[PDB]
């Protein structure tokens, strides 16, 4: 697009986020709609059943007091937009005065923002390790602090996998072994039980609205099934998988357990920490252990093809980057095009809108394929769909833009800075703005409530906010800040569009967190130094392509992704241990504590029937 | 960070707010005057 | 298509630098109570 | 050099040794020389005070009586020459075979070659770990192994440097802490000592002979400045290291604290496994933490200089690669280098012992480098000399001499071959063949015995036979691994003068751990994941050779470094850990026994006088 | 010498070759089948 | 798959005998 | 808007390098000191 | 190099102003 | 690998090394007769 | 300098055959010994 096109996308996508904005404010004052805007504080039990006023609201909670409020994960996940501010701000600015004899001064720019971004992450991954400590160290009692999950409990002709356990515990630590839960595999019984509540939704809605006896009979059935499921599934020793939860008394045991290993084939007798509870994605503890590896690399081959097949979309975008691609595309827009003024507003919002729309489902395949891996836990399972989602990204959507652009690698990066300025206001601005509306919840908390509430109690369960996101929220701010690391030292026009985005972006998700977000596991800020790594990544891309583009001088050019690493490097050993290792010091000051302040704490009691999967309970 | 971050957004738009707006309030009634 | 035409060009002819002051003096004023 | 001067070098090389092991043959049986000969009889306390039948002697003894005899770390060395012929026996063949449609030929070679190197190293890799745990398990008690040593032990006001590390220990690993021992200063004391040891030798040589009342008064002097320094080290407050090592009731405890992180900053109380007591280079123990760092800043940069100089020795030897240069840096060869014999005579062995030559104090100079740095052990000194005289080679043998080559990278490679052959049968071949002589012993046993030799007593102090020389010894082998890799799939007739070296070197070496080399410390081959990832390196660098000589098909040039570094990395994840982690299984398992086959035995007073430093003992 | 060895290489060296191929086929075959 | 990767298999090792025999002599 | 703006840039942004620098001179300084 | 190091310091400073002026403006 | 490398070298010895060894013993005895 | 040209000359033409027999021998009965 040209100039004139991003002047009036801007005007657009300005005046489209503050009508969202006027919309919101009205739907958020209509009293039945509560329940959908502050579900944190129903959820927390701290509510009962001119028009932007709410941005200064969002920012006056303490960070502190939302670390409580909301949980440290979504406080960190928020500071990424902080951080984006940080980085690029300073990169905005000097870019323009600089660079807005030649050849010089973009290595020159290419130092200067490399350091500088090295420096803004040093002190942020200082900064997210000191929270995680002090948050772990005032954490509640939880039943993952004294457990830890072992897999692939080796067999044994004779003796069960409960006695292997139980037997080796007591063996290696004697002194701190406790308890211990076998994994069962109980995922039919799971999904007959799934099945059912389904099938009840169906009932209720169908009593209310008055197929009956057809609804009833299902339910017999199911339940008959459900019943012998119990059965064969408790007495059945196949049910059994070497796997097994183990508690000890002490979290300082469990630390040493979980930070050791245990064997002498380093592949058997595996030791991790326990998720919480309420954060074990019980399917996959089904999952014998070595078919884990098999099972990775299919997705591997699975991930090629989707990135591979996926091309052509983009290449579609790409064709309606120009007006005479648009009406091939879409005659019937041709009597619309002539029109100066809708000439530009089409060629600014549709390849812009056609492109979010085809990677809308892009999340949850990602986490289709994280969740056959087999991963254990819903906090690794967002972990890894992030991962895959931002590799997607820098294939699909920059790399494959910028050379199917050119089919239509230096010279192609610069044609497209007006291509991802006109999708950052139509997938940023404007996205972040309508999110805030947050119009799924609202239909389907009315249709819960219109057709499937046979008693208030129902509608305590209509209201299921989700969570930030992480796996579908991550990766866009990773792209952005790429983008701008990218353009910045050839096309810095682009820089105040990121900008607007992680300012809009932090005060928008600033107020879902407050009022709407629940959290479903805390993993405590582990998933930064996946944050700190993409960013490195960005940085040695940028680089690289720098030297492509500019030319090569190349002891600078090369110098500049060695030293990134070395500063990657750096901050592995010094900040990454307070998310990757628990010191012992820490563990047995929290067990001092805690036996100091309840003597009489029943442990064993407490964590006895935790980890049982829920199906059973 | 955040104290010297603060002052910028005081300072700018305290003192370049107004011509930068200025700019754009004249952009817009161009355009349109240009139009149809 | 024309009746809106000419009231957009009008509206902006006459209206605009009214609304734009509006605009201007609200932003300003705004980032001035935050803090 | 030409063919004939292959030939003719290799005729004088196979007499040279030949005449070598003729001489070893009646040296070795003159009573007088025993104690020079079997040496390792001699400390072991097993020997009171053709002519080739030594090679088979030195094959007769077994693998596991060869562990016992000599020790794990020496078996594990040799078996490195077994693994070069394991590597390069097929290569050559296969080589010969196919090179002696090319291009492709190139690459196919180039992958059959990593392929079955990558194999080879895989079921090696698995061997010595077994052999490592089986050695461990029954290994002999000894102070380490409930022993840490504790770095960096942070600063307090009112508490000395014992009563933080009694305190810490005792809270934090309240079941198992026994005892700790202080870190002491007392560099200047044992300075003194060995300069008083040196007065002495002087004076009883002077005794001998007949000056004596100038060596009484050094002694007098110097006694007087041991014993004042004795009362100030220990009583002076400042010679105290924030340093202990750390005592554990049972090995289980041990493994614990050196393997986990004790406080929540990451670079305090660092804890790391104890070397023996004899392993330990306690002048080191006095460098406080914090410098470490910056002493390895500037030894990287000292190494640099140390490589960029020495690029003019090794010109100089490329120079005298031609006769005219050969002259022109020695004019009075002239007169016999119109000889034809004589010619290739020159020509073959002039270069390779300049060479040789030049290069004799390598390793003394990067040994010196590798304790400025700082390492507490004997054998992390070696291991770290061997890591930079690796690298030297890499850049002033191999690259440096195919460079300068061009001089007077794809075709200077394949000019080279000549030269590297000749380097290796004057450095391999007749090196190892002279070090069964083992001169210098001779040399310095009959002066001892002649001039400073009191008492018969002194003559099992003469009896030092030294070691295997890690640090010389294993930069050698990764020459001879290097040049075989690089060469193999463009000029395979190299590759034969290897396979002899590695063949006699095994013989030789075998006879020499038997009968003659002591064993300094003992890592239970801890080196040998440096050894693995040192091949690999190998690999890695002769695959971008082969791009660069070749040419660019890209696709499978660059999947070659690709896939040898994950296979490298499946390596680490499998086998790595029976080298760095001690499993609790394991560590429970001999304190089990221990307790049972030694049910009264007082570690306390064991381990209470271990790790004093021996000037005070 | 050479041509009668090269040829008693290749028959020596191919001996070993189809023992391989076929440990090389079950080892794929098994690697794969451990996910059923 | 594996109905295909058996014969697949069993055509692999005769192209490799074949590529090396050409290579060989 | 622009000519002013920049400058002011100059000033407001090179009012911070001054005391950066003088932590970059210090920074050396301690590193290389904690040798003796 | 103590003595050689904090000049040099002061020289960068002003070569960083100087070199900064230049692409600036 | 130790047992089939032992038959190797037997195998080596006992049948290829007769002619390997003729052909060194004629390079010499001409290398020499050339010679001066 | 000819004294030794051509005592080296005549050893290679009439003992060396001879000499070259013993050590091919040598050989192939040291390998054939080991295992
Ligand atoms: C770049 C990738 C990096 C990833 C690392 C992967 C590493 C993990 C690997 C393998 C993991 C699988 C484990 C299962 C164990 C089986 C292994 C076994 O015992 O046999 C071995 C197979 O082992 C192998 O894997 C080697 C095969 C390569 C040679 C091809 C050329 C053919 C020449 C034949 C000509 C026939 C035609 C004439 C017919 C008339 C037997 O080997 P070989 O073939 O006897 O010896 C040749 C050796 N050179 C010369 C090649 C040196
Ligand atoms: C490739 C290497 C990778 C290794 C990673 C190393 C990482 C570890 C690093 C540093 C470790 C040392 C720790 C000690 C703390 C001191 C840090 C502090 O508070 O101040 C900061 C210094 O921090 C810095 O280190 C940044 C300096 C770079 C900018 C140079 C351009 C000059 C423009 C000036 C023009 C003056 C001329 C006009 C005069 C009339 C203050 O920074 P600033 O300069 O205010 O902000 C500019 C920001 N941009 C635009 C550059 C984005
Ligand atoms: C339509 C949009 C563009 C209007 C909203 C713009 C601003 C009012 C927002 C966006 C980003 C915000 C900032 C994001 C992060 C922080 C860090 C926070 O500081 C801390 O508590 C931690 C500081 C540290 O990192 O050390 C205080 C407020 C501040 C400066 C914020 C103040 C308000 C800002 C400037
Ligand atoms: C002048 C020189 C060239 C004459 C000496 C030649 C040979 C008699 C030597 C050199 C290397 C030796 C080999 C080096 C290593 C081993 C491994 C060793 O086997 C093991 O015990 C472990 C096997 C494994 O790796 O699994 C048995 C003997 C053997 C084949 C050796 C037998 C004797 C060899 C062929
Ligand atoms: C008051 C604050 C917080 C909100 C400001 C919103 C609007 C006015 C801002 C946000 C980003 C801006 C754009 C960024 C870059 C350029 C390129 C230049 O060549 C012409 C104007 C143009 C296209 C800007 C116009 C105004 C803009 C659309
Ligand atoms: C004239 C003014 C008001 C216009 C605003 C643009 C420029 C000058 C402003 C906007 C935000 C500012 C930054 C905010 C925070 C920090 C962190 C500190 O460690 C070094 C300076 C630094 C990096 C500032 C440098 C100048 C800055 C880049
Ligand atoms: C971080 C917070 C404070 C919100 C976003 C800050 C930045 C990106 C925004 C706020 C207002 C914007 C400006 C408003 C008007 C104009 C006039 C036009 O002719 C050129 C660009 C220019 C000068 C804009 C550049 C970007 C800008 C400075
Ligand atoms: C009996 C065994 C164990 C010992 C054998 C020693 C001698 C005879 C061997 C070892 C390596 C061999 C050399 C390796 C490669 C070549 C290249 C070819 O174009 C001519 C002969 C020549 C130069 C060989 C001559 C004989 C040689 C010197
Ligand atoms: C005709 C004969 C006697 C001449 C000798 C040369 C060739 C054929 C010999 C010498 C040593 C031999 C190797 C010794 C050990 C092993 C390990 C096994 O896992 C696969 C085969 C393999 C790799 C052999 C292949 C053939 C070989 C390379
Ligand atoms: C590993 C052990 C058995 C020792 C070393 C093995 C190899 C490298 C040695 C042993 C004897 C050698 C051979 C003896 C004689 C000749 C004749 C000449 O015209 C070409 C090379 C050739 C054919 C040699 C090649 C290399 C050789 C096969
Ligand atoms: C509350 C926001 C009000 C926004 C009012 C402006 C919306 C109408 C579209 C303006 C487009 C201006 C295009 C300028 C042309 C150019 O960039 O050169
Ligand atoms: C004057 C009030 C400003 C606030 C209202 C937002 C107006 C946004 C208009 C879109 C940007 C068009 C600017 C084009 C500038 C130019 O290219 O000259
Ligand atoms: C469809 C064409 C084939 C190539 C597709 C890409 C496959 C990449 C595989 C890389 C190796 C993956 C190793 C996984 C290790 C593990 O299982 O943990
Ligand atoms: C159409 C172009 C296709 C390009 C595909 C590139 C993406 C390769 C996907 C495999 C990456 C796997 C990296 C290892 C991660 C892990 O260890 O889990
Ligand atoms: C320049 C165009 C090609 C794009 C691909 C370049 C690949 C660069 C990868 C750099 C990764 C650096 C390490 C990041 C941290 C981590 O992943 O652990
Ligand atoms: C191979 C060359 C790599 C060189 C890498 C240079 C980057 C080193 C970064 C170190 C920053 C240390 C600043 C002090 C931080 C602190 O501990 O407070
Ligand atoms: C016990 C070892 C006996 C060795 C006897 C031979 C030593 C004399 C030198 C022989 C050189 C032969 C050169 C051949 C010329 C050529 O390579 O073409
Ligand atoms: C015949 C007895 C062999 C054992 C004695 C060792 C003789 C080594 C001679 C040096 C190698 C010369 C061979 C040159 C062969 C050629 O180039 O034709
Ligand atoms: C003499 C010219 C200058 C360049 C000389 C080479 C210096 C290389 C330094 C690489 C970074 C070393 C980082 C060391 C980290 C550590 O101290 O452990
Ligand atoms: C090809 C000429 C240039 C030579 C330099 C190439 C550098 C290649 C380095 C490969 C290292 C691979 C990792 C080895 C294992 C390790 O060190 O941990
Ligand atoms: C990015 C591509 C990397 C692909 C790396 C391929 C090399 C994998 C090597 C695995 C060998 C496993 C053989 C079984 C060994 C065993 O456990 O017994």
């Known amino acids: 697009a040209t100039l004139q096109d991003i002047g009036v996308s801007a005007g657009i996508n300005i005046l489209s986020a503050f009508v969202f904005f006027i919309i919101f404010a009205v739907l958020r004052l209509q009293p039945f709609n509560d329940r959908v805007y502050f579900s944190k504080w129903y959820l927390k039990g701290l509510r009962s059943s001119k028009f932007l006023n709410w941005m200064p609201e969002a920012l006056k909670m303490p960070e502190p007091e939302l670390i409580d409020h909301a949980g440290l994960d979504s406080v960190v996940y928020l500071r990424i937009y902080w951080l984006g501010l940080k980085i690029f701000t300073p990169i905005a600015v000097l870019a323009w005065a600089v660079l807005v004899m030649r050849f010089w001064t973009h290595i020159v720019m290419a130092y200067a923002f490399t350091i500088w971004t090295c420096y803004v992450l040093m002190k942020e991954y200082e900064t997210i390790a000191n929270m995680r400590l002090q948050f772990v160290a005032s954490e509640a009692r939880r039943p993952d602090q004294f457990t830890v999950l072992v897999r692939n409990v080796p067999p044994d002709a004779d003796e069960s996998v409960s006695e292997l356990v139980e037997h080796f515990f007591l063996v290696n630590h004697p002194d701190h072994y406790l308890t211990h839960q076998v994994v069962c595999n109980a995922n039919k019984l799971a999904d007959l039980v799934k099945k059912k509540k389904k099938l009840q939704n169906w009932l209720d809605y169908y009593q209310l609205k008055y197929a009956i006896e057809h609804y009833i009979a299902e339910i017999d059935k199911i339940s008959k099934e459900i019943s012998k499921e119990r059965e064969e599934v408790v007495n059945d020793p196949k049910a059994i998988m070497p796997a097994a939860f183990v508690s000890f008394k002490t979290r300082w045991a469990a630390a040493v357990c979980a930070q050791t290993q245990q064997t002498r084939n380093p592949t058997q007798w595996l030791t991790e920490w326990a998720p919480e509870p309420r954060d074990v994605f019980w399917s996959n503890l089904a999952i014998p252990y070595v078919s884990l590896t098999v099972r990775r690399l299919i997705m591997h081959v699975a991930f090629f093809f989707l990135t591979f097949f996926f091309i052509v979309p983009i290449a579609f975008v790409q064709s309606l980057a120009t007006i005479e691609g648009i009406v091939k595309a879409a005659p019937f827009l041709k009597f619309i095009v002539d029109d100066k003024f809708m000439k530009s507003v089409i060629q600014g919002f549709l390849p812009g809108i056609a492109l979010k729309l085809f990677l809308a489902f892009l999340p949850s395949i990602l986490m289709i394929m994280s969740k056959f891996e087999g991963f254990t836990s819903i906090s690794s399972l967002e972990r890894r769909a992030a991962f895959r989602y931002y590799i997607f990204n820098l294939v699909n959507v920059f790399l494959a833009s910028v050379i199917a652009g050119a089919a239509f690698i230096g010279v192609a990066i610069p044609m497209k800075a007006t291509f991802f300025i006109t999708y950052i206001m139509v997938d940023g601005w404007a996205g972040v703005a309508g999110e805030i509306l947050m119009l799924k919840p609202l239909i389907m908390f009315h249709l819960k409530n219109a057709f499937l509430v046979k008693t208030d109690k129902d509608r305590e369960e209509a209201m299921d906010p989700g969570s930030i996101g992480f796996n579908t929220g991550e990766p866009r701010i990773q792209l952005y800040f790429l983008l701008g690391l990218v353009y910045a030292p050839v096309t810095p026009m682009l820089l105040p569009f990121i900008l607007v985005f992680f300012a809009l972006a932090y005060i928008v998700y600033r107020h879902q967190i407050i009022n709407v977000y629940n959290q479903e596991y805390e993993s405590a800020a582990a998933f930064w130094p996946d944050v700190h790594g993409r960013v490195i990544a960005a940085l040695v891309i940028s680089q690289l392509l720098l030297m492509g583009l500019l030319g090569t001088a190349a002891p600078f050019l090369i110098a500049l992704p060695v030293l990134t690493i070395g500063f990657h490097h750096f901050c592995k050993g010094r900040y990454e241990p307070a998310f990757i290792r628990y010191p012992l010091q820490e563990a047995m000051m929290k067990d001092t504590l805690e036996t100091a302040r309840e003597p009489n704490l029943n442990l064993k009691g407490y964590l006895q029937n935790a980890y049982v999967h829920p199906v059973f309970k | ?36």
Do not use: N, R, S
Not at chain 2, 22 to 36: G, P, Q, S
């Open chain 2, 1 to 36: 960070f955040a104290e010297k971050f603060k002052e910028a957004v005081k300072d700018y738009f305290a003192k370049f707010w107004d011509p930068a707006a200025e700019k754009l309030k004249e952009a817009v009634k161009d355009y349109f005057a240009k139009l149809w």
